[PDB]
Structures are given as C-alpha cells and as structure tokens.
JSON list of C-alpha atoms in Angstrom, two decimals:
[
{"chain": "A", "resi": 8, "resn": "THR", "atom": "CA", "xyz": [25.51, 30.60, 10.32]},
{"chain": "A", "resi": 9, "resn": "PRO", "atom": "CA", "xyz": [26.32, 28.46, 13.46]},
{"chain": "A", "resi": 10, "resn": "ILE", "atom": "CA", "xyz": [22.96, 26.72, 13.35]},
{"chain": "A", "resi": 11, "resn": "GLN", "atom": "CA", "xyz": [23.75, 25.95, 9.65]},
{"chain": "A", "resi": 12, "resn": "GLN", "atom": "CA", "xyz": [26.67, 24.06, 10.85]},
{"chain": "A", "resi": 13, "resn": "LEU", "atom": "CA", "xyz": [24.77, 21.95, 14.09]},
{"chain": "A", "resi": 14, "resn": "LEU", "atom": "CA", "xyz": [21.36, 21.09, 11.39]},
{"chain": "A", "resi": 15, "resn": "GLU", "atom": "CA", "xyz": [24.14, 20.01, 8.67]},
{"chain": "A", "resi": 16, "resn": "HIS", "atom": "CA", "xyz": [25.81, 17.50, 11.20]},
{"chain": "A", "resi": 17, "resn": "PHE", "atom": "CA", "xyz": [22.71, 16.45, 12.38]},
{"chain": "A", "resi": 18, "resn": "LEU", "atom": "CA", "xyz": [21.60, 15.74, 8.59]},
{"chain": "A", "resi": 19, "resn": "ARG", "atom": "CA", "xyz": [24.65, 13.80, 7.74]},
{"chain": "A", "resi": 20, "resn": "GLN", "atom": "CA", "xyz": [23.63, 11.90, 10.66]},
{"chain": "A", "resi": 21, "resn": "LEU", "atom": "CA", "xyz": [20.48, 10.99, 10.12]},
{"chain": "A", "resi": 22, "resn": "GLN", "atom": "CA", "xyz": [21.30, 10.59, 5.98]},
{"chain": "A", "resi": 23, "resn": "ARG", "atom": "CA", "xyz": [24.01, 7.61, 7.42]},
{"chain": "A", "resi": 24, "resn": "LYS", "atom": "CA", "xyz": [20.39, 5.94, 8.38]},
{"chain": "A", "resi": 25, "resn": "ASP", "atom": "CA", "xyz": [19.48, 5.44, 5.13]},
{"chain": "A", "resi": 26, "resn": "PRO", "atom": "CA", "xyz": [22.28, 3.74, 2.99]},
{"chain": "A", "resi": 27, "resn": "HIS", "atom": "CA", "xyz": [19.77, 2.98, -0.35]},
{"chain": "A", "resi": 28, "resn": "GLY", "atom": "CA", "xyz": [18.58, 6.68, -0.28]},
{"chain": "A", "resi": 29, "resn": "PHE", "atom": "CA", "xyz": [14.87, 5.91, 0.42]},
{"chain": "A", "resi": 30, "resn": "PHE", "atom": "CA", "xyz": [14.45, 9.60, 1.57]},
{"chain": "A", "resi": 31, "resn": "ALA", "atom": "CA", "xyz": [17.18, 10.90, -0.49]},
{"chain": "A", "resi": 32, "resn": "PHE", "atom": "CA", "xyz": [14.62, 12.37, -3.12]},
{"chain": "A", "resi": 33, "resn": "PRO", "atom": "CA", "xyz": [10.88, 13.50, -3.20]},
{"chain": "A", "resi": 34, "resn": "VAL", "atom": "CA", "xyz": [8.71, 10.50, -4.27]},
{"chain": "A", "resi": 35, "resn": "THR", "atom": "CA", "xyz": [7.21, 10.58, -7.50]},
{"chain": "A", "resi": 36, "resn": "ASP", "atom": "CA", "xyz": [3.54, 9.15, -8.26]},
{"chain": "A", "resi": 37, "resn": "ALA", "atom": "CA", "xyz": [5.01, 7.28, -10.97]},
{"chain": "A", "resi": 38, "resn": "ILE", "atom": "CA", "xyz": [7.22, 5.50, -8.39]},
{"chain": "A", "resi": 39, "resn": "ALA", "atom": "CA", "xyz": [4.36, 5.09, -5.76]},
{"chain": "A", "resi": 40, "resn": "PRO", "atom": "CA", "xyz": [0.67, 5.72, -7.12]},
{"chain": "A", "resi": 41, "resn": "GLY", "atom": "CA", "xyz": [-1.18, 7.64, -5.47]},
{"chain": "A", "resi": 42, "resn": "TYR", "atom": "CA", "xyz": [1.05, 9.24, -3.19]},
{"chain": "A", "resi": 43, "resn": "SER", "atom": "CA", "xyz": [0.50, 12.57, -4.20]},
{"chain": "A", "resi": 44, "resn": "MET", "atom": "CA", "xyz": [-3.47, 12.84, -3.25]},
{"chain": "A", "resi": 45, "resn": "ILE", "atom": "CA", "xyz": [-2.26, 10.80, -0.17]},
{"chain": "A", "resi": 46, "resn": "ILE", "atom": "CA", "xyz": [0.31, 12.77, 1.47]},
{"chain": "A", "resi": 47, "resn": "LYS", "atom": "CA", "xyz": [-0.23, 16.65, 1.19]},
{"chain": "A", "resi": 48, "resn": "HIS", "atom": "CA", "xyz": [3.18, 17.76, 2.30]},
{"chain": "A", "resi": 49, "resn": "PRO", "atom": "CA", "xyz": [5.92, 15.90, 1.08]},
{"chain": "A", "resi": 50, "resn": "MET", "atom": "CA", "xyz": [9.41, 16.21, 2.29]},
{"chain": "A", "resi": 51, "resn": "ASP", "atom": "CA", "xyz": [13.02, 14.72, 1.87]},
{"chain": "A", "resi": 52, "resn": "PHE", "atom": "CA", "xyz": [16.30, 14.66, 2.95]},
{"chain": "A", "resi": 53, "resn": "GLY", "atom": "CA", "xyz": [17.12, 16.49, -0.23]},
{"chain": "A", "resi": 54, "resn": "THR", "atom": "CA", "xyz": [14.52, 19.47, 0.25]},
{"chain": "A", "resi": 55, "resn": "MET", "atom": "CA", "xyz": [15.93, 19.51, 3.89]},
{"chain": "A", "resi": 56, "resn": "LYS", "atom": "CA", "xyz": [19.33, 20.41, 2.82]},
{"chain": "A", "resi": 57, "resn": "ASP", "atom": "CA", "xyz": [18.30, 22.74, 0.71]},
{"chain": "A", "resi": 58, "resn": "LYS", "atom": "CA", "xyz": [16.48, 24.49, 3.22]},
{"chain": "A", "resi": 59, "resn": "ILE", "atom": "CA", "xyz": [19.61, 24.60, 5.75]},
{"chain": "A", "resi": 60, "resn": "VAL", "atom": "CA", "xyz": [21.71, 26.23, 2.86]},
{"chain": "A", "resi": 61, "resn": "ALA", "atom": "CA", "xyz": [18.74, 28.40, 2.36]},
{"chain": "A", "resi": 62, "resn": "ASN", "atom": "CA", "xyz": [18.42, 29.35, 5.79]},
{"chain": "A", "resi": 63, "resn": "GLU", "atom": "CA", "xyz": [15.01, 28.30, 5.88]},
{"chain": "A", "resi": 64, "resn": "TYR", "atom": "CA", "xyz": [15.36, 26.93, 9.75]},
{"chain": "A", "resi": 65, "resn": "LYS", "atom": "CA", "xyz": [15.66, 29.15, 12.27]},
{"chain": "A", "resi": 66, "resn": "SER", "atom": "CA", "xyz": [15.60, 26.71, 15.31]},
{"chain": "A", "resi": 67, "resn": "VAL", "atom": "CA", "xyz": [16.20, 22.93, 15.61]},
{"chain": "A", "resi": 68, "resn": "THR", "atom": "CA", "xyz": [12.56, 22.54, 16.53]},
{"chain": "A", "resi": 69, "resn": "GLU", "atom": "CA", "xyz": [11.81, 23.36, 13.08]},
{"chain": "A", "resi": 70, "resn": "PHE", "atom": "CA", "xyz": [14.38, 21.21, 11.70]},
{"chain": "A", "resi": 71, "resn": "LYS", "atom": "CA", "xyz": [13.28, 18.03, 13.45]},
{"chain": "A", "resi": 72, "resn": "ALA", "atom": "CA", "xyz": [9.78, 19.45, 12.36]},
{"chain": "A", "resi": 73, "resn": "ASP", "atom": "CA", "xyz": [10.46, 18.62, 8.79]},
{"chain": "A", "resi": 74, "resn": "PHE", "atom": "CA", "xyz": [12.70, 15.22, 9.76]},
{"chain": "A", "resi": 75, "resn": "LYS", "atom": "CA", "xyz": [9.25, 14.02, 11.47]},
{"chain": "A", "resi": 76, "resn": "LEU", "atom": "CA", "xyz": [6.99, 15.11, 9.01]},
{"chain": "A", "resi": 77, "resn": "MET", "atom": "CA", "xyz": [9.21, 13.07, 6.25]},
{"chain": "A", "resi": 78, "resn": "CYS", "atom": "CA", "xyz": [9.04, 9.88, 8.40]},
{"chain": "A", "resi": 79, "resn": "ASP", "atom": "CA", "xyz": [5.23, 10.75, 9.56]},
{"chain": "A", "resi": 80, "resn": "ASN", "atom": "CA", "xyz": [4.70, 11.02, 5.51]},
{"chain": "A", "resi": 81, "resn": "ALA", "atom": "CA", "xyz": [6.76, 7.57, 4.80]},
{"chain": "A", "resi": 82, "resn": "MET", "atom": "CA", "xyz": [4.65, 5.64, 7.53]},
{"chain": "A", "resi": 83, "resn": "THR", "atom": "CA", "xyz": [1.23, 6.75, 6.19]},
{"chain": "A", "resi": 84, "resn": "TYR", "atom": "CA", "xyz": [1.84, 6.20, 2.21]},
{"chain": "A", "resi": 85, "resn": "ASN", "atom": "CA", "xyz": [3.40, 2.64, 2.94]},
{"chain": "A", "resi": 86, "resn": "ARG", "atom": "CA", "xyz": [2.22, -0.82, 4.61]},
{"chain": "A", "resi": 87, "resn": "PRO", "atom": "CA", "xyz": [3.89, -2.00, 7.72]},
{"chain": "A", "resi": 88, "resn": "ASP", "atom": "CA", "xyz": [5.74, -4.57, 6.29]},
{"chain": "A", "resi": 89, "resn": "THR", "atom": "CA", "xyz": [7.50, -2.61, 3.94]},
{"chain": "A", "resi": 90, "resn": "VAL", "atom": "CA", "xyz": [11.19, -1.55, 3.94]},
{"chain": "A", "resi": 91, "resn": "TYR", "atom": "CA", "xyz": [9.91, 1.80, 4.01]},
{"chain": "A", "resi": 92, "resn": "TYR", "atom": "CA", "xyz": [7.79, 2.09, 6.88]},
{"chain": "A", "resi": 93, "resn": "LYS", "atom": "CA", "xyz": [10.43, 0.14, 9.08]},
{"chain": "A", "resi": 94, "resn": "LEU", "atom": "CA", "xyz": [12.85, 2.60, 8.51]},
{"chain": "A", "resi": 95, "resn": "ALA", "atom": "CA", "xyz": [10.88, 5.65, 8.67]},
{"chain": "A", "resi": 96, "resn": "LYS", "atom": "CA", "xyz": [9.42, 4.57, 12.29]},
{"chain": "A", "resi": 97, "resn": "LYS", "atom": "CA", "xyz": [13.12, 3.05, 13.13]},
{"chain": "A", "resi": 98, "resn": "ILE", "atom": "CA", "xyz": [14.99, 6.39, 11.99]},
{"chain": "A", "resi": 99, "resn": "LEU", "atom": "CA", "xyz": [12.38, 8.89, 13.54]},
{"chain": "A", "resi": 100, "resn": "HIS", "atom": "CA", "xyz": [12.76, 7.63, 17.27]},
{"chain": "A", "resi": 101, "resn": "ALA", "atom": "CA", "xyz": [16.40, 7.13, 16.71]},
{"chain": "A", "resi": 102, "resn": "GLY", "atom": "CA", "xyz": [17.46, 10.44, 14.85]},
{"chain": "A", "resi": 103, "resn": "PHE", "atom": "CA", "xyz": [15.11, 12.33, 17.63]},
{"chain": "A", "resi": 104, "resn": "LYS", "atom": "CA", "xyz": [17.18, 10.78, 20.62]},
{"chain": "A", "resi": 105, "resn": "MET", "atom": "CA", "xyz": [20.32, 11.62, 18.27]},
{"chain": "A", "resi": 106, "resn": "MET", "atom": "CA", "xyz": [19.36, 15.14, 18.08]},
{"chain": "A", "resi": 107, "resn": "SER", "atom": "CA", "xyz": [18.44, 15.71, 22.00]},
{"chain": "B", "resi": 4, "resn": "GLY", "atom": "CA", "xyz": [-2.19, 2.16, -10.89]},
{"chain": "B", "resi": 5, "resn": "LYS", "atom": "CA", "xyz": [-2.02, -0.59, -8.09]},
{"chain": "B", "resi": 6, "resn": "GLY", "atom": "CA", "xyz": [0.10, -1.08, -4.97]},
{"chain": "B", "resi": 7, "resn": "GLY", "atom": "CA", "xyz": [2.80, 1.05, -2.97]},
{"chain": "B", "resi": 8, "resn": "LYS", "atom": "CA", "xyz": [6.46, 1.37, -3.87]},
{"chain": "B", "resi": 9, "resn": "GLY", "atom": "CA", "xyz": [9.04, -1.27, -4.13]},
{"chain": "C", "resi": 8, "resn": "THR", "atom": "CA", "xyz": [-23.95, -30.40, -14.23]},
{"chain": "C", "resi": 9, "resn": "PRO", "atom": "CA", "xyz": [-26.58, -28.62, -12.47]},
{"chain": "C", "resi": 10, "resn": "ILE", "atom": "CA", "xyz": [-24.04, -26.71, -9.66]},
{"chain": "C", "resi": 11, "resn": "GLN", "atom": "CA", "xyz": [-22.06, -25.96, -12.28]},
{"chain": "C", "resi": 12, "resn": "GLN", "atom": "CA", "xyz": [-25.21, -23.71, -13.97]},
{"chain": "C", "resi": 13, "resn": "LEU", "atom": "CA", "xyz": [-26.10, -21.91, -10.72]},
{"chain": "C", "resi": 14, "resn": "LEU", "atom": "CA", "xyz": [-22.18, -21.11, -10.19]},
{"chain": "C", "resi": 15, "resn": "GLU", "atom": "CA", "xyz": [-21.98, -19.59, -13.73]},
{"chain": "C", "resi": 16, "resn": "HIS", "atom": "CA", "xyz": [-24.90, -17.86, -13.27]},
{"chain": "C", "resi": 17, "resn": "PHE", "atom": "CA", "xyz": [-23.57, -16.64, -10.24]},
{"chain": "C", "resi": 18, "resn": "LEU", "atom": "CA", "xyz": [-19.91, -15.93, -11.36]},
{"chain": "C", "resi": 19, "resn": "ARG", "atom": "CA", "xyz": [-21.35, -13.88, -14.09]},
{"chain": "C", "resi": 20, "resn": "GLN", "atom": "CA", "xyz": [-23.68, -11.62, -11.72]},
{"chain": "C", "resi": 21, "resn": "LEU", "atom": "CA", "xyz": [-20.33, -11.28, -9.53]},
{"chain": "C", "resi": 22, "resn": "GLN", "atom": "CA", "xyz": [-18.40, -10.13, -12.30]},
{"chain": "C", "resi": 23, "resn": "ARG", "atom": "CA", "xyz": [-20.86, -7.65, -13.58]},
{"chain": "C", "resi": 24, "resn": "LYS", "atom": "CA", "xyz": [-19.70, -5.77, -10.44]},
{"chain": "C", "resi": 25, "resn": "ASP", "atom": "CA", "xyz": [-16.48, -5.47, -11.66]},
{"chain": "C", "resi": 26, "resn": "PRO", "atom": "CA", "xyz": [-16.26, -3.51, -14.86]},
{"chain": "C", "resi": 27, "resn": "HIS", "atom": "CA", "xyz": [-12.94, -2.81, -14.96]},
{"chain": "C", "resi": 28, "resn": "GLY", "atom": "CA", "xyz": [-11.64, -6.08, -14.55]},
{"chain": "C", "resi": 29, "resn": "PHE", "atom": "CA", "xyz": [-9.57, -5.66, -11.46]},
{"chain": "C", "resi": 30, "resn": "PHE", "atom": "CA", "xyz": [-10.62, -9.01, -10.25]},
{"chain": "C", "resi": 31, "resn": "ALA", "atom": "CA", "xyz": [-10.69, -10.63, -13.63]},
{"chain": "C", "resi": 32, "resn": "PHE", "atom": "CA", "xyz": [-7.29, -12.54, -13.63]},
{"chain": "C", "resi": 33, "resn": "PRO", "atom": "CA", "xyz": [-4.39, -13.19, -11.34]},
{"chain": "C", "resi": 34, "resn": "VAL", "atom": "CA", "xyz": [-2.37, -10.39, -9.65]},
{"chain": "C", "resi": 35, "resn": "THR", "atom": "CA", "xyz": [1.43, -10.26, -10.60]},
{"chain": "C", "resi": 36, "resn": "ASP", "atom": "CA", "xyz": [4.16, -9.39, -8.32]},
{"chain": "C", "resi": 37, "resn": "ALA", "atom": "CA", "xyz": [5.21, -7.09, -11.26]},
{"chain": "C", "resi": 38, "resn": "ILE", "atom": "CA", "xyz": [2.33, -4.68, -10.89]},
{"chain": "C", "resi": 39, "resn": "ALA", "atom": "CA", "xyz": [1.69, -5.16, -7.31]},
{"chain": "C", "resi": 40, "resn": "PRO", "atom": "CA", "xyz": [5.16, -5.22, -5.56]},
{"chain": "C", "resi": 41, "resn": "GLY", "atom": "CA", "xyz": [5.65, -7.55, -2.89]},
{"chain": "C", "resi": 42, "resn": "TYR", "atom": "CA", "xyz": [2.27, -8.95, -3.31]},
{"chain": "C", "resi": 43, "resn": "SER", "atom": "CA", "xyz": [3.12, -12.70, -3.36]},
{"chain": "C", "resi": 44, "resn": "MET", "atom": "CA", "xyz": [4.62, -12.63, -0.21]},
{"chain": "C", "resi": 45, "resn": "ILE", "atom": "CA", "xyz": [2.10, -11.11, 1.45]},
{"chain": "C", "resi": 46, "resn": "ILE", "atom": "CA", "xyz": [-1.29, -12.91, -0.07]},
{"chain": "C", "resi": 47, "resn": "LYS", "atom": "CA", "xyz": [-0.41, -16.64, 0.19]},
{"chain": "C", "resi": 48, "resn": "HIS", "atom": "CA", "xyz": [-3.26, -17.92, -1.50]},
{"chain": "C", "resi": 49, "resn": "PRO", "atom": "CA", "xyz": [-4.43, -15.93, -4.56]},
{"chain": "C", "resi": 50, "resn": "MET", "atom": "CA", "xyz": [-7.71, -16.11, -6.55]},
{"chain": "C", "resi": 51, "resn": "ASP", "atom": "CA", "xyz": [-9.75, -14.42, -8.92]},
{"chain": "C", "resi": 52, "resn": "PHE", "atom": "CA", "xyz": [-12.86, -14.68, -11.09]},
{"chain": "C", "resi": 53, "resn": "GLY", "atom": "CA", "xyz": [-10.98, -16.18, -14.17]},
{"chain": "C", "resi": 54, "resn": "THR", "atom": "CA", "xyz": [-9.36, -18.92, -11.68]},
{"chain": "C", "resi": 55, "resn": "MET", "atom": "CA", "xyz": [-13.00, -19.70, -10.49]},
{"chain": "C", "resi": 56, "resn": "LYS", "atom": "CA", "xyz": [-14.29, -19.71, -14.04]},
{"chain": "C", "resi": 57, "resn": "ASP", "atom": "CA", "xyz": [-11.99, -22.37, -14.54]},
{"chain": "C", "resi": 58, "resn": "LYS", "atom": "CA", "xyz": [-12.53, -24.04, -11.22]},
{"chain": "C", "resi": 59, "resn": "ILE", "atom": "CA", "xyz": [-16.42, -24.42, -12.07]},
{"chain": "C", "resi": 60, "resn": "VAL", "atom": "CA", "xyz": [-16.03, -25.63, -15.87]},
{"chain": "C", "resi": 61, "resn": "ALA", "atom": "CA", "xyz": [-13.47, -28.63, -13.91]},
{"chain": "C", "resi": 62, "resn": "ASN", "atom": "CA", "xyz": [-16.12, -29.08, -11.38]},
{"chain": "C", "resi": 63, "resn": "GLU", "atom": "CA", "xyz": [-13.89, -28.42, -8.65]},
{"chain": "C", "resi": 64, "resn": "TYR", "atom": "CA", "xyz": [-17.06, -27.04, -6.24]},
{"chain": "C", "resi": 65, "resn": "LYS", "atom": "CA", "xyz": [-19.44, -29.38, -5.00]},
{"chain": "C", "resi": 66, "resn": "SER", "atom": "CA", "xyz": [-21.12, -26.59, -3.26]},
{"chain": "C", "resi": 67, "resn": "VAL", "atom": "CA", "xyz": [-22.19, -23.30, -3.35]},
{"chain": "C", "resi": 68, "resn": "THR", "atom": "CA", "xyz": [-20.53, -23.08, 0.24]},
{"chain": "C", "resi": 69, "resn": "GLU", "atom": "CA", "xyz": [-17.31, -23.84, -1.65]},
{"chain": "C", "resi": 70, "resn": "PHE", "atom": "CA", "xyz": [-17.61, -21.50, -4.50]},
{"chain": "C", "resi": 71, "resn": "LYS", "atom": "CA", "xyz": [-18.60, -18.82, -1.91]},
{"chain": "C", "resi": 72, "resn": "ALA", "atom": "CA", "xyz": [-15.39, -19.48, -0.05]},
{"chain": "C", "resi": 73, "resn": "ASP", "atom": "CA", "xyz": [-12.92, -18.82, -3.12]},
{"chain": "C", "resi": 74, "resn": "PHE", "atom": "CA", "xyz": [-15.15, -15.46, -3.36]},
{"chain": "C", "resi": 75, "resn": "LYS", "atom": "CA", "xyz": [-14.64, -14.20, -0.22]},
{"chain": "C", "resi": 76, "resn": "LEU", "atom": "CA", "xyz": [-10.54, -15.58, -0.36]},
{"chain": "C", "resi": 77, "resn": "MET", "atom": "CA", "xyz": [-10.45, -13.11, -3.47]},
{"chain": "C", "resi": 78, "resn": "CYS", "atom": "CA", "xyz": [-12.00, -10.16, -1.49]},
{"chain": "C", "resi": 79, "resn": "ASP", "atom": "CA", "xyz": [-9.85, -10.81, 1.35]},
{"chain": "C", "resi": 80, "resn": "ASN", "atom": "CA", "xyz": [-7.29, -10.95, -0.50]},
{"chain": "C", "resi": 81, "resn": "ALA", "atom": "CA", "xyz": [-7.69, -7.55, -2.02]},
{"chain": "C", "resi": 82, "resn": "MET", "atom": "CA", "xyz": [-8.42, -5.94, 1.37]},
{"chain": "C", "resi": 83, "resn": "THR", "atom": "CA", "xyz": [-5.41, -7.30, 3.01]},
{"chain": "C", "resi": 84, "resn": "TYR", "atom": "CA", "xyz": [-2.68, -6.08, 0.11]},
{"chain": "C", "resi": 85, "resn": "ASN", "atom": "CA", "xyz": [-4.78, -2.90, -1.03]},
{"chain": "C", "resi": 86, "resn": "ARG", "atom": "CA", "xyz": [-4.83, 0.36, 1.12]},
{"chain": "C", "resi": 87, "resn": "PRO", "atom": "CA", "xyz": [-8.20, 1.44, 2.21]},
{"chain": "C", "resi": 88, "resn": "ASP", "atom": "CA", "xyz": [-8.32, 4.54, 0.22]},
{"chain": "C", "resi": 89, "resn": "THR", "atom": "CA", "xyz": [-7.55, 2.82, -3.03]},
{"chain": "C", "resi": 90, "resn": "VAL", "atom": "CA", "xyz": [-10.03, 1.64, -5.74]},
{"chain": "C", "resi": 91, "resn": "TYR", "atom": "CA", "xyz": [-9.18, -1.77, -5.11]},
{"chain": "C", "resi": 92, "resn": "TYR", "atom": "CA", "xyz": [-10.22, -2.30, -1.38]},
{"chain": "C", "resi": 93, "resn": "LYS", "atom": "CA", "xyz": [-13.54, -0.19, -1.65]},
{"chain": "C", "resi": 94, "resn": "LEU", "atom": "CA", "xyz": [-14.42, -2.37, -4.66]},
{"chain": "C", "resi": 95, "resn": "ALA", "atom": "CA", "xyz": [-13.52, -5.76, -2.83]},
{"chain": "C", "resi": 96, "resn": "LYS", "atom": "CA", "xyz": [-15.32, -4.55, 0.53]},
{"chain": "C", "resi": 97, "resn": "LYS", "atom": "CA", "xyz": [-18.79, -3.27, -1.65]},
{"chain": "C", "resi": 98, "resn": "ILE", "atom": "CA", "xyz": [-18.77, -6.69, -3.80]},
{"chain": "C", "resi": 99, "resn": "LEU", "atom": "CA", "xyz": [-18.05, -9.40, -0.40]},
{"chain": "C", "resi": 100, "resn": "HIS", "atom": "CA", "xyz": [-20.98, -7.99, 1.17]},
{"chain": "C", "resi": 101, "resn": "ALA", "atom": "CA", "xyz": [-23.22, -7.64, -1.82]},
{"chain": "C", "resi": 102, "resn": "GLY", "atom": "CA", "xyz": [-22.19, -10.68, -3.40]},
{"chain": "C", "resi": 103, "resn": "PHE", "atom": "CA", "xyz": [-22.57, -12.99, -0.32]},
{"chain": "C", "resi": 104, "resn": "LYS", "atom": "CA", "xyz": [-26.28, -11.37, 0.09]},
{"chain": "C", "resi": 105, "resn": "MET", "atom": "CA", "xyz": [-26.63, -12.00, -3.54]},
{"chain": "C", "resi": 106, "resn": "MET", "atom": "CA", "xyz": [-26.31, -15.68, -3.54]},
{"chain": "C", "resi": 107, "resn": "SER", "atom": "CA", "xyz": [-28.37, -16.08, -0.34]}
]
C-alpha cells in the first residue's frame, strides 16, 4: 500500500540514526539481565519492519506509538549514562520531529 | 545476573 | 589489637546479612559493564577484612565509612529493582544501627 511506502521511508530514516543497530533486533535476557521482567512490551526496528510488511499499522500515529514504545523501553531499562539511553532519548525526539 | 547491557 | 577484634566481630555480623556473597569480593567490569567508569572508589567486604588485618582502620568511624562506601556503590550502580540495590539499602541501615 501507500501507507507502506510512507512508513518504509520513515523507518529507513530512523534506522540510519542507529549505525550500531542497538535497536535493530529484539533484546534478550542474556545480553540484558532482567530485561523481560522489567519491559513488558518489547519493540525493535526489525519487529516494526515486519509489522509494515504485514500491514498492521493503519496510520502513521500507530507507527509512531511503536517507535516511542521502543525508545521508552530503552530509557527505562538502561542507566541514563549509557549509549543505549542516550541514543534512545535522542532518536525519540528527533524521529518525532522528522515524521511530523 | 548483574547489570544491564554493555 | 583490641580495635581489630571489634571490627572483625562487626565484619562478621555484617557478612551474615549477605548469604550469597554479593559483597564478598571486588566487582569487575567483566560482570558489571561500565562498573569501573561509574564507581571511582570500589569497596567490598573482602577488602575491608584485609584492611582490619592490616590495622588500616584507627576507629569504628573509618570502618563504618568503608561499609557505607560499599553500600553507596551498589545503590549507585544497580537499578533499584535489583537484588543488589535492595540488599545494599537494607544492610546499610541495619548495619549502621547494629554498630551503634
């Protein structure tokens, strides 16, 4: 669909802000001790791609809520001085400005 | 068991 | 020395509070990422025991300040929900009471 074109572009633009791919793939408790108990609704760019391909977003509002959920979860789990926290808070605000 | 990522 | 017997008794009653030995040995960066960038003055009970046997503490005041350091390190680095944070908080207050 055309929403798919739109969302695929926003996705690729957001994902360029993450050159190490910190957000490319689901987090597992082995790389992030205690993650699945703290974060109740995990999200990552890969899951978001598949939701685009699968036509699950019906509006750009729904896509931006999963983006924010992904950055919210990183803020929550990771200590503020960490590359993870920094990059989540930075990309959350810039990606929302980019996609308005 | 201890920390976050890194 | 008499201060050494006193401190050894206190060190023993404190360690009994830590049945898993979370506080027994130095924390390494290997098992707590970024830990040495964040905690600039490490302490643990095994180092406090070496300290007592070396007659490094001239007062209970100096020993209590190392115990405090150790709990403040764990409350600084560990997230509040963790076993490590909750133990450190608990034993800080109970051990200061017990030493008075």
